[PDB]
Amino acid sequence: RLVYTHAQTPDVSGVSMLEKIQQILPQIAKNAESAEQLRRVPDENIKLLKEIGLHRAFQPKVYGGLEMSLPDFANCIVTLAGACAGTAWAFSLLCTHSHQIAMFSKQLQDEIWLKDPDATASSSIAPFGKVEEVEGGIILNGDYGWSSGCDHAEYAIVGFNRFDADGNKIYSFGVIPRSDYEIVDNWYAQAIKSSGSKMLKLVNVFIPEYRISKAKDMMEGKSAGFGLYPDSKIFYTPYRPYFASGFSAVSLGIAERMIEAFKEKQRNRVRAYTGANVGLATPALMRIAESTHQVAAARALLEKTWEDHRIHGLNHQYPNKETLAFWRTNQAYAVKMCIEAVDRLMAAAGATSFMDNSELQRLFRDAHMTGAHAYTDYDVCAQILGRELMGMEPDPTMV
Amino acid sequence: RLVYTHAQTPDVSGVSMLEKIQQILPQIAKNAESAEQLRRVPDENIKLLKEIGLHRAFQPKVYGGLEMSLPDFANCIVTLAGACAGTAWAFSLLCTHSHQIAMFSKQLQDEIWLKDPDATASSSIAPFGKVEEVEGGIILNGDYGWSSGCDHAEYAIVGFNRFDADGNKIYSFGVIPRSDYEIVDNWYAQAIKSSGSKMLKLVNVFIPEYRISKAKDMMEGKSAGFGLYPDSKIFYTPYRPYFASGFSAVSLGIAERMIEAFKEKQRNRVRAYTGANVGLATPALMRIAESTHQVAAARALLEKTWEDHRIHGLNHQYPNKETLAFWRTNQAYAVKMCIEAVDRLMAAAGATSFMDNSELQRLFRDAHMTGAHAYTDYDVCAQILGRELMGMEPDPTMV
Amino acid sequence: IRLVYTHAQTPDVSGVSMLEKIQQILPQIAKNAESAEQLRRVPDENIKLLKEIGLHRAFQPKVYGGLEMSLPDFANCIVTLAGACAGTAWAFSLLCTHSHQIAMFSKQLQDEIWLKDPDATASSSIAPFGKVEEVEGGIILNGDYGWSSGCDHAEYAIVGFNRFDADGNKIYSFGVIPRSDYEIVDNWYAQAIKSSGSKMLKLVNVFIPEYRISKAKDMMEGKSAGFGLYPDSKIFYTPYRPYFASGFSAVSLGIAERMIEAFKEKQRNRVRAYTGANVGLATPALMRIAESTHQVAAARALLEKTWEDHRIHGLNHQYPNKETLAFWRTNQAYAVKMCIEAVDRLMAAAGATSFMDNSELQRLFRDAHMTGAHAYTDYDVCAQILGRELMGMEPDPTMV
Amino acid sequence: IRLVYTHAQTPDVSGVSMLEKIQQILPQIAKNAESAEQLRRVPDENIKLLKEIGLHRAFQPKVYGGLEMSLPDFANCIVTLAGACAGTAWAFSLLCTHSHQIAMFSKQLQDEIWLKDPDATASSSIAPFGKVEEVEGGIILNGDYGWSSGCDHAEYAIVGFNRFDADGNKIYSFGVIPRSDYEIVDNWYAQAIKSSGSKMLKLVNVFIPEYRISKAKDMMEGKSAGFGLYPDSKIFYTPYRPYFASGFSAVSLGIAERMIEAFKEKQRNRVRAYTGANVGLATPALMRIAESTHQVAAARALLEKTWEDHRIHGLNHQYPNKETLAFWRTNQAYAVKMCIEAVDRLMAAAGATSFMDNSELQRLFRDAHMTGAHAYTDYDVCAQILGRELMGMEPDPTMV
Numbered sequence A, B: 001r002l003v004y005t006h007a008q009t010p011d012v013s014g015v016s017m018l019e020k021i022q023q024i025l026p027q028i029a030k031n032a033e034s035a036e037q038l039r040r041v042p043d044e045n046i047k048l049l050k051e052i053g054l055h056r057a058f059q060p061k062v063y064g065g066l067e068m069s070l071p072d073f074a075n076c077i078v079t080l081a082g083a084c085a086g087t088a089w090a091f092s093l094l095c096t097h098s099h100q101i102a103m104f105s106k107q108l109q110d111e112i113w114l115k116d117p118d119a120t121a122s123s124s125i126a127p128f129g130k131v132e133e134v135e136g137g138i139i140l141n142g143d144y145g146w147s148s149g150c151d152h153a154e155y156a157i158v159g160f161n162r163f164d165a166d167g168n169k170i171y172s173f174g175v176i177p178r179s180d181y182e183i184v185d186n187w188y189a190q191a192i193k194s195s196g197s198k199m200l201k202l203v204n205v206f207i208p209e210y211r212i213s214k215a216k217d218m219m220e221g222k223s224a225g226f227g228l229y230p231d232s233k234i235f236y237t238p239y240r241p242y243f244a245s246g247f248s249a250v251s252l253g254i255a256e257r258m259i260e261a262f263k264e265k266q267r268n269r270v271r272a273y274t275g276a277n278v279g280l281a282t283p284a285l286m287r288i289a290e291s292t293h294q295v296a297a298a299r300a301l302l303e304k305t306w307e308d309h310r311i312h313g314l315n316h317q318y319p320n321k322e323t324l325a326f327w328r329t330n331q332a333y334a335v336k337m338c339i340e341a342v343d344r345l346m347a348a349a350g351a352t353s354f355m356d357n358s359e360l361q362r363l364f365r366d367a368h369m370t371g372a373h374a375y376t377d378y379d380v381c382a383q384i385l386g387r388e389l390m391g392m393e394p395d396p397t398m399v
Numbered sequence C, D: 001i002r003l004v005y006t007h008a009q010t011p012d013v014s015g016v017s018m019l020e021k022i023q024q025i026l027p028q029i030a031k032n033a034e035s036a037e038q039l040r041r042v043p044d045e046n047i048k049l050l051k052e053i054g055l056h057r058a059f060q061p062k063v064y065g066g067l068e069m070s071l072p073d074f075a076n077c078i079v080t081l082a083g084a085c086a087g088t089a090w091a092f093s094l095l096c097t098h099s100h101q102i103a104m105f106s107k108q109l110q111d112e113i114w115l116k117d118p119d120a121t122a123s124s125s126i127a128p129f130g131k132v133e134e135v136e137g138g139i140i141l142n143g144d145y146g147w148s149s150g151c152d153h154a155e156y157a158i159v160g161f162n163r164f165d166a167d168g169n170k171i172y173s174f175g176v177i178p179r180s181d182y183e184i185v186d187n188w189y190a191q192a193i194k195s196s197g198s199k200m201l202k203l204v205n206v207f208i209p210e211y212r213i214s215k216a217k218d219m220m221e222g223k224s225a226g227f228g229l230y231p232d233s234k235i236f237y238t239p240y241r242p243y244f245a246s247g248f249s250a251v252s253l254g255i256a257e258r259m260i261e262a263f264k265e266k267q268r269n270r271v272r273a274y275t276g277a278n279v280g281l282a283t284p285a286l287m288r289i290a291e292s293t294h295q296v297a298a299a300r301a302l303l304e305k306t307w308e309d310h311r312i313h314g315l316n317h318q319y320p321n322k323e324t325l326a327f328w329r330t331n332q333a334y335a336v337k338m339c340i341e342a343v344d345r346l347m348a349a350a351g352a353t354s355f356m357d358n359s360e361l362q363r364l365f366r367d368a369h370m371t372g373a374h375a376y377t378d379y380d381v382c383a384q385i386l387g388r389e390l391m392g393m394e395p396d397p398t399m400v
């Protein structure tokens, strides 16, 4: 029998990553409050999650990785997000970054992992950096904002633009060691506080050519690492859908938790002004129902989208324009529904739900934060998909 | 690779029912306009659909039936609805009625089908009839509204209440031959005109005990036909989810077609006033995108819900309270989203789209009609699901 | 003097207000509604009743025997009227608001139309499809001119077209032409507002003299041939467009307030077909009636405020600035949008019986949606218009 | 005299309207907003500025030196104020509206409060949690009384509780008590409207004499001990509740209008972080700015019309009937809902940077949502209130 309201446990001989997550969820949940005030992932959380080996979800097998299918991984993040959004978000990123690193030169991966198999990377992909072409590579300078989990990373992946002959943009990534940059703690946010999305500062950082890949190359299986893992079900696939797979996941995790948390607080709710017993009043019930439907519908769409990714990966098959448009955008619609579903409940939650000591207020905030990311902006997404459906050239103004 | 915007063709060897539908879809589509003025399904359409054997979708195998899985059938109705909603709707009902007949006595099924293997039944399940208990059965009298396809049926299934010693409602159905009732043609509607939902008139109709089953019995596998088909993947299952499976189906069919129809008419559109080519303007695109997303999300939820029906059927497993609530209501949420998606497009359609000679106007009407059936009313559904989620006793005021 | 949230308040005038006069004839209009739908135009009775109370002279200059009603007072008669037959209200509103435009043409033209017959009115078709040849003394116009509400009951038609400069740039103009110069082609088969008789005008080598031709821009800025003719008037020193298009939102509002009333009446006694239960007062129904009431009351407030602004401007002989003009162009579109939300919220709890031919809701629902399909009520266009203005951007010549 | 859609119109009444006086001090209020949020109450400066212009005497009777402002004029001050610091506006609104209620108590009580100190104000906690013993001459009340906006700046508190009939039915009453009779407990750690200082009052064996106790029903129907005291006043012959709860929607509107302005400012120069192109004027953004503008203008129209209704009623010393009362109870709830939709439509295009502590939007978004979480602004309850009334049903004693 299927389950509509949450992740179904892959019954497998040998216990699943998702069960392993489920056992440690109470601890995560209890640190949630002190994680918010810490403005990063508490050391305990990292240690627990790494202990179950989650961070090696997308690490190639040759280095001791699991190579989880997207669905299985997504669902761990969703489940995780239910307990601490910021943790789930940050940790998702640390994880999905290995899937990218896996497309770089064999030499780079060897450098990172043969040395330390538990090493991970945070990122800052927005190309703010000023780049000088020296011989052998580049020198990069810049302030690189928004690096979730950067405190717990040994490397960072960093985005920038290079130019060819007709000084055209060549969008590239560089992997750099933790010693090459300072973490500046300017992370004072109002949602997903626990993700530690501090900013990386880069001063005359040299990056050799072998730690630099073209984005386009990693979208189309032409990067230096292509063909390295001929048996893998997850590497013969565009880098971006994976890396960005966390946002919607976290968002959905929040939504499903909101429903549960709202239901718990709803049962016993009294009317301040009259004293009457009001937890089972029809309006409340209808909201719980509709939000349940809405996130169930969102989970269906994400589940179907993830299956699509998995199937493609299995078959070592790069998607076409249309499927690519859908993979870029369905997640944004999912995120959008999930927020509608959180809002519908928060709106019936009453004043007490906005107190610091109430969980709803944090879920509500975090939920909204998931729709503020560049990759989840639905205005941009509607235009992307739309243009594709009418068979129009893409707008280079968005991506 | 998965498909977001429509039914995926089950790549069997040989001809799937769905391909067979797809080949006849142009003809159905061309009769659509004269079907609307006919106020019932044109004889051609019935003949074409019966020829491909679709009406035997849920007929037991022993009488020459196919015993299609719910998903496979649902998807034929969705596809069909894209060409003529009223046809798809009416015909869906004529089909899903066999699934119910199949739970009646062996004697009844023998009576209907050994005699004529192509016979089908229309229905009127709202218990308006006055019922006298005579010995050996009942005499029923009543005007029975809303019998989709009743012009093309050889039997009608007809709902009524019988009473205990306690004098409590026992909701029952009776199958009655076409000779036992007059079709009154009072079907003047403003949507799904082609369904021929005329009203059955019953005057002192006698119904023998063997043509009468309790609804509750068919919900719980206790009706006279339980056990008859020990190998069947579709009869060990409550009757209602199958019978009502066509509404959301039709509704989805209509939505997917709107998006196609809108896109076609959109390309070349000029502003009436300023005379400007305007088919590719950003707002239109964004509506095409989001309606696309919306119905895709609906399709995902229905596809997931149907899988759940299929799985249960396979395992001869009757669902529990919770899954039952979800099966009762997810369809209603799907219908709701589908109508939102139609409305979002009809609203950018401009005045020309409301002309009799435009398809959009019919799709828009028919789409709305699908949310007006008793089983798809979302207000009632949210209350049903809601009460279940909070662990409340059901409200006998709705069902 | 308590305010009223759910409908037009009756102006205590001297003598009998136009709105009371409408209110007395509303039953008759309402009883013809069903046969008007099958007639595909306004029934002769309705025209005769409405003209008898003098409504068609709502915007006719006083010198010819007109009333010169303020926008709010007129709008509110349409809203009320629309409650009984949307198509009648819509058609008739147009026949009415056309005089306000005629009043900006040459004194000679007005004299021609009204000194001859004071009850004469005009239908229109303003979308510039016509092919236009510049002959000397005026133009020859040819074209099929769609969508002329009330055109069966009109003696003239106002017709839109483009002329060109030296430099070949569009000069959007209107011409008033007699009923004898065109054929009404009956291609009006619609699924909403059937009774408006929006048939299409056919024009074959119609000659139009220069004096029956005004520039749209001139009528927007008080520069047309009729500017200054009525120095005491509270309604002519004002751009033509806001008035002419004032009817759409009005009708749309009329339909919404009526839906609420109609839904309430049918709701009381409603049963579930399935359970047998008397279900008219169930909390979900109540909440929908409430929220639809709030939503249309909120639309009414925005329209009433917008109308006041038109009135105030007209009083002061003051042409609005860019910002107010943007608001006048678009507030009505938002109102129309809310009204349709309000109708939908109710039709969605209406059940299957409400979609029958013999039910009023089905008509109101259809009509309500038709009011948001007009080119002037399209909200996507309006959001862009108002948006550009608020950010201080040049207007998009792509829409208007 | 041209109307304004996007904000309060300045009442031209020459000399300085209260609203102008507000507008001059708004920059200061705005600059303290950030440190007010961390203070979790209204900064002493803000109180001092606002009291200096005399705003707190908005509803104080004239005999004590009050202004007796009309509801519209006051409401609009709160709206304007809320644009700069919601929590200030909210708290101060309450301190203000409480005088309107005090004005219905015995002449002796008002004399006690104001003849002594004419600047004295009261905070409240109206939810009847208190346990109440009937002693002779009055009551002894005990309880923890949550949510007392501005309670740090008040000299008295108004406190709600239930007493009982012969056959012991709830008699809902209010008691005014001096600041010495209760402790302020600082448990106010919220995530919205932080600056309102809505701390909780603790009451230990507080004695309340009969003359500082009024029945709520009496103050709803002009039967309280202070009825008739100000025979010339335009604002006291009116149920107490619509005035006291007038601030919430007002604040909520204030925040919305400010969101639009704030969003517009930040939108202009917004690049993509991803591609590299002036993204501030993209069509989606424009349309959201447009539609939110329309939505809050429509909300403003409904509140403005509702306020006028209160004003007209007050003028005429006329207590409203069931229907208008249902509307006054609920329109504000709809207004608040629209305002939050409008805020959300913008916050959703605002991008990640808008959720930083150093961004104003994030605070506006939070505060905006908080206004819809009060017991009087809950729309579910409101739809059921209005709905039942419209269908002519007895009220549900389960909500109020």
Ligand SMILES: Cc1cc2nc3c(=O)[nH]c(=O)nc-3n(C[C@H](O)[C@H](O)[C@H](O)COP(=O)(O)O)c2cc1C
Pocket: B271, B272, B349, B350, B351, B352, B353, C094, C123, C124, C125, C126, C127, C146, C147, C148, C149, C150, C193, C196, C198, C370, C371, C373, C374, C375, C376
């Ligand atoms: C109910 C209906 C009646 C109309 N009546 C008139 C009319 O009498 N005169 C006129 O110029 N346009 C009329 N219009 C047409 C519009 O002005 C405009 O040309 C049309 O809405 C263009 O929309 P489109 O993009 O669907 O073609 C009417 C439109 C509809 C909605």
Ligand SMILES: Cc1cc2nc3c(=O)[nH]c(=O)nc-3n(C[C@H](O)[C@H](O)[C@H](O)COP(=O)(O)O)c2cc1C
Pocket: B093, B122, B123, B124, B125, B126, B145, B146, B147, B148, B149, B192, B195, B197, B369, B370, B372, B373, B374, B375, C271, C272, C273, C350, C351, C352, C353, C354
């Ligand atoms: C398009 C249309 C077709 C219908 N066809 C049938 C049918 O054939 N058999 C049936 O028992 N009920 C049919 N129903 C009626 C519903 O089962 C139910 O009686 C009706 O929705 C009651 O809704 P109401 O509250 O408006 O009466 C149909 C309803 C509509 C929407």
Ligand SMILES: Cc1cc2nc3c(=O)[nH]c(=O)nc-3n(C[C@H](O)[C@H](O)[C@H](O)COP(=O)(O)O)c2cc1C
Pocket: A270, A271, A272, A349, A350, A351, A352, A353, D094, D123, D124, D125, D126, D127, D146, D147, D148, D149, D150, D193, D196, D198, D370, D371, D373, D374, D375, D376
């Ligand atoms: C921002 C905030 C401030 C409030 N300030 C007051 C106040 O000063 N006086 C008062 O009686 N109630 C105040 N209320 C509390 C409400 O009157 C009511 O008791 C509370 O909203 C009950 O809602 P609940 O169901 O969440 O408990 C306030 C509520 C919130 C939203």
Ligand SMILES: Cc1cc2nc3c(=O)[nH]c(=O)nc-3n(C[C@H](O)[C@H](O)[C@H](O)COP(=O)(O)O)c2cc1C
Pocket: A093, A122, A123, A124, A125, A126, A145, A146, A147, A148, A149, A192, A195, A197, A369, A370, A372, A373, A374, A375, D271, D272, D273, D350, D351, D352, D353, D354
């Ligand atoms: C919660 C939060 C965490 C983020 N974490 C990262 C990250 O770790 N790496 C990264 O490259 N971008 C991250 N982003 C930033 C986005 O990729 C992007 O630069 C940002 O959303 C731009 O949006 P804006 O238009 O508001 O500037 C994050 C954004 C938010 C919503």
